[PDB]
């Protein structure tokens, strides 16, 4: 583990997944990550599961994620919900 200018957004499964400061917000891949990230989580259960999750692409299609297991200091202000669930065939996520 080691200090980054990442914060967190949503946990799935149980997994924090922080984004880049320096980029836009991530509504519309809220619910996008969400559920690619619910695959990595139910072929690993428990510890199995990563501890975190940089999730990035503000514009331009950008959608690139990353893996990283290594919990540190942290924490959220609020949230109460986003209401959305957006449908696509090609799915470049998954």
Known sequence: PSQTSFK?????????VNMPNNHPDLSNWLPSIELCVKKYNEKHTGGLKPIEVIAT????????????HSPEVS???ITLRIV????DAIKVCE
């Open 75 to 77: 924490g959220e202000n």
């Open 84 to 87: 959305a669930n957006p449908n």
């Open 57 to 68: 692409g503000g514009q331009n299609n950008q959608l690139t994620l990353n893996y990283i």
């Open 8 to 16: 967190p957004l949503t946990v799935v499964d149980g997994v924090a």
